[PDB]
Design an enzyme around this catalytic site. Structure first.
Site, PDB file in Angstrom:
ATOM      1  N   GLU A 176     -11.955  15.607   1.357  1.00  0.00           N
ATOM      2  CA  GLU A 176     -12.872  15.701   0.516  1.00  0.00           C
ATOM      3  C   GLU A 176     -14.481  16.104   1.332  1.00  0.00           C
ATOM      4  OE1 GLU A 176     -15.818  14.195  -1.397  1.00  0.00           O
ATOM      5  OE2 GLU A 176     -16.106  15.591  -1.924  1.00  0.00           O
TER       6      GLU A 176
ATOM      7  N   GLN B 294     -12.377   7.910   1.935  1.00  0.00           N
ATOM      8  CA  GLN B 294     -13.793   7.592   0.973  1.00  0.00           C
ATOM      9  C   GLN B 294     -14.470   6.277   1.556  1.00  0.00           C
ATOM     10  OE1 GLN B 294     -16.141   6.811  -2.587  1.00  0.00           O
ATOM     11  NE2 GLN B 294     -15.471   8.876  -2.838  1.00  0.00           N
TER      12      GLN B 294
ATOM     13  N   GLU C  50      -3.577 -11.319  22.554  1.00  0.00           N
ATOM     14  CA  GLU C  50      -3.279 -12.186  22.382  1.00  0.00           C
ATOM     15  C   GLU C  50      -3.303 -12.144  20.721  1.00  0.00           C
ATOM     16  OE1 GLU C  50      -5.636 -13.398  26.985  1.00  0.00           O
ATOM     17  OE2 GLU C  50      -6.022 -14.744  24.897  1.00  0.00           O
TER      18      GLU C  50
HETATM   19  N1  LIG Z   1     -13.997  -2.436  -0.965  1.00  0.00           N
HETATM   20  C1  LIG Z   1     -14.619  -0.966  -0.961  1.00  0.00           C
HETATM   21  N2  LIG Z   1     -13.498  -0.514  -1.454  1.00  0.00           N
HETATM   22  C2  LIG Z   1     -13.423   1.182  -2.162  1.00  0.00           C
HETATM   23  C3  LIG Z   1     -14.432   1.639  -1.759  1.00  0.00           C
HETATM   24  N3  LIG Z   1     -14.605   2.720  -2.070  1.00  0.00           N
HETATM   25  C4  LIG Z   1     -13.289   3.153  -3.094  1.00  0.00           C
HETATM   26  N4  LIG Z   1     -12.784   1.524  -2.367  1.00  0.00           N
HETATM   27  C5  LIG Z   1     -11.107   1.919  -2.985  1.00  0.00           C
HETATM   28  O1  LIG Z   1     -10.764   2.891  -2.637  1.00  0.00           O
HETATM   29  C6  LIG Z   1      -9.256   3.208  -3.602  1.00  0.00           C
HETATM   30  C7  LIG Z   1      -9.055   4.235  -4.125  1.00  0.00           C
HETATM   31  O2  LIG Z   1      -9.363   5.389  -2.701  1.00  0.00           O
HETATM   32  P1  LIG Z   1     -10.487   6.020  -1.949  1.00  0.00           P
HETATM   33  O3  LIG Z   1     -11.432   5.783  -0.956  1.00  0.00           O
HETATM   34  O4  LIG Z   1     -11.500   5.665  -3.447  1.00  0.00           O
HETATM   35  O5  LIG Z   1     -10.458   7.675  -2.376  1.00  0.00           O
HETATM   36  P2  LIG Z   1      -9.241   8.029  -0.935  1.00  0.00           P
HETATM   37  O6  LIG Z   1      -9.136   7.082  -0.430  1.00  0.00           O
HETATM   38  O7  LIG Z   1     -10.894   9.070   0.066  1.00  0.00           O
HETATM   39  O8  LIG Z   1      -8.039   8.671  -1.441  1.00  0.00           O
HETATM   40  P3  LIG Z   1      -8.077  10.081  -2.164  1.00  0.00           P
HETATM   41  O9  LIG Z   1      -8.683   9.702  -4.130  1.00  0.00           O
HETATM   42  O10 LIG Z   1      -7.208  11.168  -2.551  1.00  0.00           O
HETATM   43  O11 LIG Z   1      -9.375  10.521  -2.047  1.00  0.00           O
HETATM   44  C8  LIG Z   1     -10.444   2.644  -4.949  1.00  0.00           C
HETATM   45  O12 LIG Z   1      -9.464   1.734  -5.225  1.00  0.00           O
HETATM   46  C9  LIG Z   1     -11.478   1.535  -4.517  1.00  0.00           C
HETATM   47  O13 LIG Z   1     -11.017   0.170  -4.948  1.00  0.00           O
HETATM   48  C10 LIG Z   1     -16.060   0.893  -1.181  1.00  0.00           C
HETATM   49  O14 LIG Z   1     -16.805   1.189  -0.779  1.00  0.00           O
HETATM   50  N5  LIG Z   1     -15.873  -0.428  -0.837  1.00  0.00           N
HETATM   51 MG   LIG Z   2     -11.819  10.884  -2.280  1.00  0.00          MG
END
Ligand SMILES: Nc1nc2c(ncn2[C@@H]2O[C@H](COP(=O)(O)OP(=O)(O)OP(=O)(O)O)[C@@H](O)[C@H]2O)c(=O)[nH]1
Ligand SMILES: [Mg+2]
Ligand SMILES: Nc1nc2c(ncn2[C@@H]2O[C@H](COP(=O)(O)OP(=O)(O)O)[C@@H](O)[C@H]2O)c(=O)[nH]1
Lengths: 256, 430, 91, 430
Positions: free
Chosen positions: D62, D11, D245
């Site tokens: 998802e 996500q 590089e």
């Molecule tokens: N910088 C930034 N971090 C994000 C964002 N959305 C989620 N995160 C970080 O991602 C972490 C959790 O992973 P997610 O990307 O939300 O979910 P996922 O990687 O798809 O893993 P699943 O929960 O199995 O779906 C959280 O602790 C957030 O800090 C975003 O839009 N920007």
């Molecule tokens: Mg997710």
């Protein structure tokens, strides 16, 4: 303190009891207190392996382990890898190793190379014997090993009964068998000579030969004298059922 | 995709569902005739989660209604939104259990359950990708607490990898309506721990306390308690039906809120809740939501959460709001209350944001926290059970239908072991 | 498991006088490899498995398709080979 | 004849990919429909007549985020069958996305990667984006990196991972999968850049003067950093730098490739034009510890090598006159065995502004990529968080039951201990 018990954890293996003996020559060694602390207080049938080392006897050891399981026997060896270990572990057999501490190595965690003198996984009880100077070599532990075997077979002094049967199995995969055979003959213990080592194969071959055709190339003169004085039984088979039948017979009955 | 089916049993569960489905239909704009009349496009994108499609364009819930007597389902059909339920899913017996757990679990419930299991299997085999099941039932009744829990084991035996939810109402000693409540409560808790993936306890006493103190309405009725329970139920799966900044399905909550497989008994609460006369005074802000969310009186259980330490916590924010404020407020609610949070697991609060708020509200929060304070309920239930069992009172009713006292002894011992090992981690230190 | 900067040593050697006995008892609260077993057991089991092979194959086919797999719901199984492979597996 | 492929998984990865892909389309004049109303070739490909197709692939188990992408204004841009989507989420469980559901999806992604690579003739390398504190993100990123490292071999891969903040956290179990993913990408990725959210929140609050930021504001800054890094491949410059590089200039040893970034200037249009934004002041602001893009203090450690990119009308002599001033300062000290540690790049194209965004239009900007010894603190604190819960084996049952072995947790701990020892061993003077 002449001895000290420890819990010994084999890497990727079973928990064993390890006993360090600090003076193997100690007069009136307290075997009763040692065996009480290890909970080895019953009288057990004993199968003593003489000259046990790594060998191609795999199925023979399966039969030996089966006979020992059915007779509730303790197996006693030299604490090194023999190929008996998988069958002992699977059947929850008691395997007792007796070795000089200086002649064996502790197993390394995640070692890609096994030392042939490494303590093998499958031993439930290890007796590492030392002298005062820590200079003990192979064969010097033999008196302690036989005294331990006799005490394991007697059990607690309060059980008014004959000792359990003891059988020796001469494998002779190591050259250091002679002192253990000399002591076994001195204590009037039966010795099964098992096929598969060069020394045992020579003894079996000469036992079938007429006196004029006997050739001794590997067996010392002292061992030839012991063969006439002791109760030796020749097993010219590597079959698992034949060794099981021999062990079960000698643990149940004394044929002499 | 990733949809769930609804199964309810007993009178209490049927009354809970009769409002849960009304709330869901009002949220998705479905008329009581099954015709969509909504306003927003998002109202139809993920309607397959709870509703099936039939010819003529109408929608039908995938709910299964079971009871040992026909009265409650014959009454729920005449209520509003009662026509949505498919007549084929109604299964009932002609005898009833009479609040006797043995009758509803050994003699009568065993023969009937084949028919309901047939329709349950029909519903689950067909659906696109199963997410799991959610169960509503009461532990204070015989037929419910027996047939529902046996059905839990039967479902778990056939779908070991799916997730299972149970919303369970346990009998409180304050408002008691049945004298044999401890027996079938203790017997049910024994089976419920072994099979349910998640359990959420709800108490009528806490609902009355909330209605009298926070909403301050004069005459509470079962309709208000059902409405609160329904709002709490809907809040959990909101982000699975709507887009959001951080989507979090039920399995993700299961991963993050259950440290050990036997500790899955949560207590919940819903915010905001305000009286009619004070709904204009208050201003809806994230601090205002989070201060009411962790309030002790706001919990849906009489258990006092400052009598123990939280193992973990979860919050499901609704509406459009900034994430930085949510994270900083969650940190602040955890720094100012360090004494009530277990210390050997750092950062034990989970947060999620969904951009679609409830109809009529701009912001809402659903709270699900796993705390050690829940031990007090099992303590009092077991206390009443052992006070009544020592004299073998009312025991002949249960023992006349093939049950024995050994199953009572094992249930008591297992429940006490659960009580002990749940508090074992309260005194644990790093 | 070797630690940081430990190429190798021995990771499991000694505890105090069988203390681990209490811990192992709390914690406690084997595959038969026919190729390593006695030749008689291997040969007799293989004879029995041949004798009853038709029964075992009927049992296998009877149960291998009884589970509800959402994956193989009729719409997304694009190939006959995927159905055949699934029907050849038991869960 | 120079190309690069960007991989977006999870996500957070998809939400930052959207952020970078508005910016690239805006910077190259391509409308959201993909139609122009020779520098595009680095990120895009010509279809023969009309539209351009990005060299990017979106991954997630998802479906919500992908469905949101496929209905927005950018529905016509991306190829319909490179937005690979699953059905069931990993739910923050690392073992799920590495052993259970990711394996059945990884083959399609690898087929798409091959189909995109056969089109490129001068492939510079890969880019990958993934938020580390999630199941599918970390697990699929690990699996994809492991497959690519053997399918292609020596091709360079760059990872823009977002580690969790020191104290601010959204999940409760993210240290486990963060440590496991660090284990996985330690021996498999050539460059890893630190991106935790707390530092960027502080940057927005202090400079942009936004008191309620959302994820989009963070992702826009990350997109600007990516554009500044890759500008040298598609615009004429007096001192060019290529992706290949880097390991010759920023990576002293194969194990040490984690570095932290910074950007300057960051200022709003309301007060940007009142000050001259000279090169000296922007290069001073870039080295300020409070402007680090990861919450780490550079004053706590030595520097190893600094690679820093300029763009706009900057003149090399002014750059040298500012590098001298930084070498002069007593609060910034380099490691003993590195006499010169600066690699300088100069480009002519000024940064582009996104309408409705936060940043204003300026003629000069600086982006630094600096490798420093102080990064070990984040590893130490993550290790401390991991040990607290691994002492009691909490939450382990959620991982053992998904096919992972018990001992897999220990070796990641040993590799982190090895990395921390290596960072201490390197930083001592001779
Ligand atoms: N910088 C930034 N971090 C994000 C964002 N959305 C989620 N995160 C970080 O991602 C972490 C959790 O992973 P997610 O990307 O939300 O979910 P996922 O990687 O798809 O893993 P699943 O929960 O199995 O779906 C959280 O602790 C957030 O800090 C975003 O839009 N920007
Ligand atoms: Mg997710
Ligand atoms: N919230 C709510 N609780 C109810 C309602 N009706 C009954 N209950 C609770 O359910 C308990 C009795 O359960 P019972 O009807 O015997 O369950 P059954 O045996 O399965 O039919 C009582 O203690 C009530 O508190 C209702 O309409 N709403």
């Amino acid at each position: 303190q002449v001895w000290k018990p420890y819990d010994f954890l084999f890497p990727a293996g079973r928990l064993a009891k390890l006993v360090k003996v600090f003076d193997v020559y100690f007069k009136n060694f307290p075997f009763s207190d040692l065996l009480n602390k290890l909970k080895l207080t019953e009288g057990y049938p004993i199968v003593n392996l003489i000259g046990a080392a790594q060998s191609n006897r795999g199925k023979f050891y399966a039969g030996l382990a089966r006979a020992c399981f059915n007779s509730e026997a303790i197996i006693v060896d030299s604490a090194i890898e023999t190929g008996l270990e998988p069958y002992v572990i699977r059947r929850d057999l008691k395997l007792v190793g007796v070795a000089p501490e200086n002649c064996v190595k502790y197993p390394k965690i995640n070692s890609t190379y096994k030392d042939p003198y490494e303590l093998s996984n499958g031993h439930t009880h290890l007796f590492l014997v030392n002298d005062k100077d820590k200079t003990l070599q192979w064969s010097q532990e033999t008196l302690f090993k036989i005294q331990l075997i006799l005490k394991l077979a007697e059990g607690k002094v309060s059980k008014k009964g004959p000792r359990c049967k003891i059988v020796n199995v001469l494998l002779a995969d190591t050259p250091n068998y002679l002192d253990e055979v000399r002591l076994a003959v001195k204590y009037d213990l039966p010795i099964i000579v098992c096929k598969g080592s060069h020394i045992c194969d020579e003894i079996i071959k000469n036992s079938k030969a007429q006196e004029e055709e006997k050739q001794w190339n590997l067996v010392d003169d002292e061992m030839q004298e012991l063969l006439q004085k002791g109760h030796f039984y020749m097993l010219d088979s590597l079959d698992s059922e034949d060794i099981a039948q021999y062990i079960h017979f000698f643990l149940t009955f004394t044929p002499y | 995709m990733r949809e769930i089916v609804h199964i309810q049993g007993g009178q209490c569960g049927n009354q809970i569902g009769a409002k849960f489905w009304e709330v869901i239909s009002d949220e998705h704009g479905i008329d009581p005739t099954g015709t969509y009349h909504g306003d927003s496009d998002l109202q139809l994108e993920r309607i397959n989660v709870y509703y099936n499609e039939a010819t003529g364009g109408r929608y039908v819930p995938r709910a299964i209604l079971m009871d040992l007597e026909p009265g409650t389902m014959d009454s729920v059909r005449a209520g509003p939104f009662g026509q949505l339920f498919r007549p084929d899913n109604f299964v009932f017996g002609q005898t009833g259990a009479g609040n006797n757990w043995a009758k509803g679990h050994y003699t009568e419930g065993a023969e009937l359950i084949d028919s309901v299991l047939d329709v349950v299997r029909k519903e689950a085999e067909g659906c696109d990708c199963l997410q799991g099941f959610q169960i509503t039932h009461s532990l204070g009744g015989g037929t419910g607490s027996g047939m529902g829990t046996l059905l839990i084991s039967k479902v778990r035996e056939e779908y070991p990898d799916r997730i299972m939810e149970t919303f369970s109402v346990v009998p409180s000693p304050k408002v008691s309506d049945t004298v044999v409540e401890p027996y079938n409560a203790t017997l049910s808790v024994h089976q419920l721990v072994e099979n349910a993936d998640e359990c959420m306890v709800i108490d009528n006493e806490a609902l009355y306390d909330i209605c009298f103190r926070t909403l301050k309405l004069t005459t509470p009725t079962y309709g208000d308690l059902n409405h609160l329970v329904s709002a709490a139920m809907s809040g959990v799966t909101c982000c699975l039906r709507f887009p959001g900044q951080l989507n979090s399905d039920l399995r993700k909550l299961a991963v993050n809120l259950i440290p050990f497989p036997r500790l899955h008994f949560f207590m919940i609460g819903f915010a905001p809740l305000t009286s009619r006369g004070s709904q204009q005074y208050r201003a809806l802000t994230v601090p205002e939501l989070t201060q009411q969310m962790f309030d002790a009186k706001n919990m849906m259980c009489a258990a006092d959460p400052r009598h123990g330490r939280y193992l973990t916590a979860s919050a499901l924010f609704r509406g459009r709001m900034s994430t930085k404020e949510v994270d900083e407020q969650m940190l602040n609610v955890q720094n100012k209350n360090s004494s009530y949070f277990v210390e050997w697991i750092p950062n034990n609060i989970k947060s999620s944001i969904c951009d679609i708020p409830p109809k009529g509200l701009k912001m809402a929060v659903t709270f699900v926290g796993n705390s050690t304070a829940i031990q007090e309920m099992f303590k009092r239930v077991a206390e009443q059970f052992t006070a009544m069992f020592r004299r073998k009172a009312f025991l002949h009713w249960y023992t006349g239908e093939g049950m024995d006292e050994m199953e009572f002894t094992e249930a008591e011992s297992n429940m006490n072991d659960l009580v002990s090992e749940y508090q074992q981690y309260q005194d644990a230190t790093a | 498991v070797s630690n940081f900067n430990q190429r190798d040593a021995e990771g499991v050697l000694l505890f105090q006088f069988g203390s681990r006995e209490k811990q192992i008892k709390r914690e406690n609260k084997q595959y038969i490899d026919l190729d390593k077993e006695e030749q008689r057991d291997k040969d007799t089991i293989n004879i029995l498995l041949r004798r009853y092979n038709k029964i075992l194959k009927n049992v296998f086919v009877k149960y291998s398709n009884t589970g509800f797999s959402a994956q193989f719901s009729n719409k997304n199984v694009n190939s006959f080979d995927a159905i055949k492979e699934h029907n050849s597996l038991i869960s | 004849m120079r190309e690069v492929i960007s991989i977006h998984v999870g996500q957070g990865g998809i939400q930052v990919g959207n952020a970078c892909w508005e910016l690239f389309c805006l910077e190259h004049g391509i409308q959201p429909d993909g139609q122009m109303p020779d520098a595009f070739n680095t990120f895009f490909s010509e279809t023969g007549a009309g539209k351009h197709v990005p060299r990017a692939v979106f991954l997630d188990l998802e479906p919500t985020v992908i469905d949101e992408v496929r209905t927005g204004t950018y529905r016509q841009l991306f190829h319909p069958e490179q937005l690979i989507s699953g059905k069931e989420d990993a739910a923050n469980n690392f073992a799920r996305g590495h052993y259970t559901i990711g394996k059945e999806i990884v083959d399609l992604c690898l087929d798409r990667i091959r189909k995109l690579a056969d089109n490129c003739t001068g492939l510079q390398g890969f880019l990958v984006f993934n938020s580390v504190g999630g199941g599918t993100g970390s697990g699929l990123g690990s699996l994809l990196l492991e497959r690519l490292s053997v399918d292609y071999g020596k091709k360079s891969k760059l990872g823009f991972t977002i580690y969790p903040s020191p104290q601010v956290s959204t999940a409760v179990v993210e240290p486990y999968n963060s440590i496991l993913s660090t284990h996985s990408l330690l021996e498999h990725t050539d460059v890893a850049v630190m991106l935790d959210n707390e530092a960027i929140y502080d940057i927005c609050r202090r400079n942009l003067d936004i008191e309620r930021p959302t994820y989009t504001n963070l992702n826009r800054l990350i997109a600007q950093v990516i554009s500044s890094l890759t500008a040298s491949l598609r615009f004429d410059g007096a001192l060019n730098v290529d992706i290949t590089e880097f390991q010759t200039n920023l990576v002293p040893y194969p194990r040490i490739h984690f570095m932290l970034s910074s950007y300057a200037p960051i200022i709003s249009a309301e007060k940007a034009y009142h000050e001259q934004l000279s090169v000296a002041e922007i290069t001073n602001s870039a080295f300020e510890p409070a402007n680090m893009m990861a919450k780490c203090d550079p004053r706590h450690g030595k520097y190893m090598a600094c690679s820093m990119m300029y763009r706009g009308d900057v003149v090399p002599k002014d750059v040298n006159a500012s590098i001298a001033t930084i070498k002069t300062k007593r609060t910034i000290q380099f490691v003993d065995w590195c006499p010169t540690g600066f690699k300088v790049g100069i480009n002519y194209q000024p940064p582009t502004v996104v309408p409705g965004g936060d940043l204003a239009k300026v003629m000069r900007a600086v982006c630094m990529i600096s490798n420093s010894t102080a990064i070990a603190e984040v590893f130490s604190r993550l290790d401390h968080k991991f040990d607290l819960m691994y002492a009691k084996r909490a939450f382990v049952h959620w991982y053992v039951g998904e096919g992972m072995e018990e001992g897999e947790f220990s070796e990641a701990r040993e590799d982190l201990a090895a990395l921390e020892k290596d960072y201490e061993e390197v930083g001592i003077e001779t």
